[PDB]
């Protein structure tokens, strides 16, 4: 019931499946029908699986598991304990925060295609366009000298 190493999990995918015993008063109307028509086992279970939170995605790069079956120490009343490690490669985006070393911070408002950037006489396009009106009033002229 654990996700496989190397799986690319999306927003809401199941990482670890886990069921919980349910009382005979918590069942939904659609649940009582399926329990009564089939006469299933007394182990009525609710789905409490570990799912991916919103805004998360990536490859499962590692799994660690602890069980009472082994000598693994756990707190009182905890049978099994599983950790899944998810890695994501974040490229630079709109809204990401950049800063020099002179207190010149700002968020990315626009990523332009390489052909849109102002380019030097030999065709080399500039990489980052910093607005002029910031430099003189913030009293950090070193950022110009560093340039």
């Amino acid at each position: 019931g654990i996700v496989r190493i190397g799986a690319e999990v999306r927003d809401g995918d199941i990482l670890v499946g886990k069921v919980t015993p349910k009382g005979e008063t918590e069942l939904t109307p659609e649940e009582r029908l399926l329990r009564a028509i089939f006469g299933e086992k007394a182990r009525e279970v609710r789905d409490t699986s570990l799912k991916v939170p919103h805004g998360e995605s990536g490859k499962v790069i590692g799994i660690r598991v602890f069980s009472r079956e082994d000598e693994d120490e756990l707190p009182a009343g905890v049978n099994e304990l599983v950790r899944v490690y998810v890695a994501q490669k974040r490229k630079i985006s709109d809204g990401d925060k950049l800063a020099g070393r002179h207190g010149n911070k700002g968020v990315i408002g626009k990523i332009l295609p390489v052909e849109d950037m102002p380019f030097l006489a030999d065709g080399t396009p500039v990489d980052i366009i910093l607005n002029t009106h910031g430099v003189p009033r913030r009293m950090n002229i070193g950022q110009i000298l560093e340039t």
């Binding site: 190493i5 190397g6 690319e8 999306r10 490859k59 499962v60 490229k91 295609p113 052909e115 080399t124």
Partner: protein
Amino acid sequence: ISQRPTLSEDVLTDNRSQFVIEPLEPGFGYTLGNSLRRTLLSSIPGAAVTSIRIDGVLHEFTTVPGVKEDVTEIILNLKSLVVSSEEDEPVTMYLRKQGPGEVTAGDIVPPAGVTVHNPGMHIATLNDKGKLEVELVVERGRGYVPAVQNRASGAEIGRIPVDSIYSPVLKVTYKVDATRVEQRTDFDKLILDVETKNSISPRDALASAGKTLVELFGLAR
């Protein structure tokens, strides 16, 4: 006043050439050179690696025994691969290496129609205990496309999608010379400098750009 424009090539290296277009209206050089530069940097067809499968790994964030680099660094090194394909269809190259040495792009066996233009490009360095075995899917496309996740494909787990930088042109600039005599005959001479990634010649890239631009401007009719 009337004289049709003429395009003359002037090579500098095997993968860099200038192109002169002399009889253009005044003020008309910069915009034409810039349209050509946009098309060159944007929509020139090429080929690159789509996905890779390394034997003994399931994701990028791991190491291979005996290799000095990790899989992430190996993929960053493979980013510099220049390759050309005539198949226009997902094809597969292979790479196997054993024992001490330096795995370079020359160690790759491309199929028919696929050629690797920089055999000396460093990929990995292997020691006594090192063995590397990589499958590389090469596809033919244009522009830039980010790695296609295994949800949008029927791809199984071992497949490692990779960013594909399809553009084969390297650097494009232009320069106009404005002849504005005291008489009535003024004209700009455009000089477009094109450098490609050794996969195609500047002549072919400029030809593709010209075809794309002609097809586009044919709309106003």
